[PDB]
Design a protein around this ligand. Sequence first.
Ligand SMILES: NC(=O)C1=CN([C@@H]2O[C@H](COP(=O)(O)OP(=O)(O)OC[C@H]3O[C@@H](n4cnc5c(N)ncnc54)[C@H](OP(=O)(O)O)[C@@H]3O)[C@@H](O)[C@H]2O)C=CC1
Ligand SMILES: NC(=O)C1=CN([C@@H]2O[C@H](COP(=O)(O)OP(=O)(O)OC[C@H]3O[C@@H](n4cnc5c(N)ncnc54)[C@H](OP(=O)(O)O)[C@@H]3O)[C@@H](O)[C@H]2O)C=CC1
Lengths: 287, 287
Amino acid sequence: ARRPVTVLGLGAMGRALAGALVAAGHPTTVWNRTPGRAAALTAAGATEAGTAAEAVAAGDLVVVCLLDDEVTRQVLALVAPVLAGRTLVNLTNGTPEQARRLAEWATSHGADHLDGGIMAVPAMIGQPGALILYSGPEDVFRAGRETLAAFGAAHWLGADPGAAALHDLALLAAMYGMFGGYLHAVAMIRAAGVPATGFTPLATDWLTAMLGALPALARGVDSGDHAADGSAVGMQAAAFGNLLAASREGGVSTSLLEPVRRLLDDAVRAGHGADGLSALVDLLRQS
Amino acid sequence: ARRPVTVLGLGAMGRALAGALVAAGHPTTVWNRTPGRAAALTAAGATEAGTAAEAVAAGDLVVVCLLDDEVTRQVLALVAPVLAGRTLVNLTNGTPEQARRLAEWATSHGADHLDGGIMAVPAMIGQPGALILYSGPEDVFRAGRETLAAFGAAHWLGADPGAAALHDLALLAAMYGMFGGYLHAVAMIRAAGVPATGFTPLATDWLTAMLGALPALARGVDSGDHAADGSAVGMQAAAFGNLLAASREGGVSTSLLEPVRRLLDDAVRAGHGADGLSALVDLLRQS
Ligand SMILES: NC(=O)C1=CN([C@@H]2O[C@H](COP(=O)(O)OP(=O)(O)OC[C@H]3O[C@@H](n4cnc5c(N)ncnc54)[C@H](OP(=O)(O)O)[C@@H]3O)[C@@H](O)[C@H]2O)C=CC1
Ligand SMILES: NC(=O)C1=CN([C@@H]2O[C@H](COP(=O)(O)OP(=O)(O)OC[C@H]3O[C@@H](n4cnc5c(N)ncnc54)[C@H](OP(=O)(O)O)[C@@H]3O)[C@@H](O)[C@H]2O)C=CC1
């Protein structure tokens, strides 16, 4: 039932993942490059190993949560002789192409492969609300899905090994988008002596409602029909000029706004002024 | 539902506003540069004037809903001889500094002034929940509220005539940040084949959760303590690179992402790495 797992990487997230597996009843074998990181985990039942090969030999599922991909692929080489017959689960973050290169390496050593992107902070691992995106052979995922649940939620995005990274990084770009907009709003609000707490209620409500617009932008993106609904790219543009002028007269930098300006203006010059926001997506694809 | 109102401007939004006032019983007089947009309006009890001045002299509250502040100010200078004793409500979009100039102009000709941001589409006007932001002298608003409710939700946001524009545009900045990050994410997801209509559920849930960090960030902006929330500007600027890299791998521009990258790097160079995102706000201040 609770299958034996290996955790390679005893950093902040490594120790939260390993703890989560012990707290779930999985016999957890850990390993770190530097010693001294497993005292509370070993006192919970975890076994610390001295060799990375030793560790990986003690699990049918090898969770890897190292620093970058550079570290990861080095370490996994040292274990390459014993890797065959286990599933790799790289919860280390990276690019989608890196995930796709490691999938080849793994499959050339007779190891299955799953990539993951943790949408959670170490402090939430094991507890509700944690999300870890996963990508890889659907086969491999179904088998590990329950093991992986010890971390939180397991959401599979497809057999593209880079699918976890891609949704991880895209969800970051969205997050940074909203926050970027919000901090500029706050900067404008603060420039005029207006307290920030107090505006955020109104912001959340506004943004919550705006989120209901996305299913229609989704449609037009996938459809091709970039038809408007009451505010076409050309109108939205004129509105952005006031936003740039309000920021320039209150003493706030337009730096976060200037890309959005150019993408709107470029859709006007492209022929989408009477179209909807969905037509701005392939405008970001220079390929 | 009984103060006499004048609508200068019979575009799409203009015709909404006036029909909402007629639908409330308000005695309403309408004017548009181009004649022939009054049919339904007059048939509902309204009255169309020929000169803006005639129209302004038949109403106490003068709702202005024209094309830009230039058009507005041109039109209002025509009616300045007859603007004394009246209350201007400029529902035409604009900047904070523009409202404050219109205020002083009206006081100088004997008129009261509220500025207005319509956070609604013309079809929502009159319907409950259509949001319009007003700012100006407070007792002017309190006397107008029952008229202003014809259009829907009237909110007063300060004696500063510039306040409604500052809140309209600041919520616009916020909404364009989120759309920006959604569009950049969809670009990325679409470059790999992922249909966006299936991605939108995961985006909405993800961004809805990320809205929870705002009330913390706001306290930081207001307090001065940009204490980390765990994730720090210095680590939020170490996965901005995998995002940048994945964006390139999929043929997607980094245009909407370079300003956040730079701001995050500026904060590190300012000693705010261990601080949280709330520090970025006072770095958005034009030096
Ligand atoms: N921390 C977080 O909140 C989040 C992190 N992640 C991702 O998780 C991964 C790990 O982050 P985190 O746990 O905080 O990392 P840490 O900074 O805590 O440490 C990284 C891990 O890599 C090990 N390591 C570093 N260099 C080497 C090396 N040359 N050879 C072998 N092992 C090495 C470290 O052991 P040593 O003691 O020897 O350095 C440590 O176990 C990253 O890819 C990160 O993006 C996921 C989401 C958020
Ligand atoms: N529509 C919307 O969804 C939103 C609109 N608003 C605000 O409402 C305003 C009106 O929008 P909407 O009704 O859709 O715009 P329209 O383009 O439908 O109408 C614009 C108005 O401006 C008038 N106008 C244009 N040029 C002149 C001029 N030189 N002299 C006099 N009048 C002139 C037009 O009169 P004419 O018929 O003769 O051209 C018309 O009444 C916007 O500019 C904005 O400030 C608020 C938020 C969103």
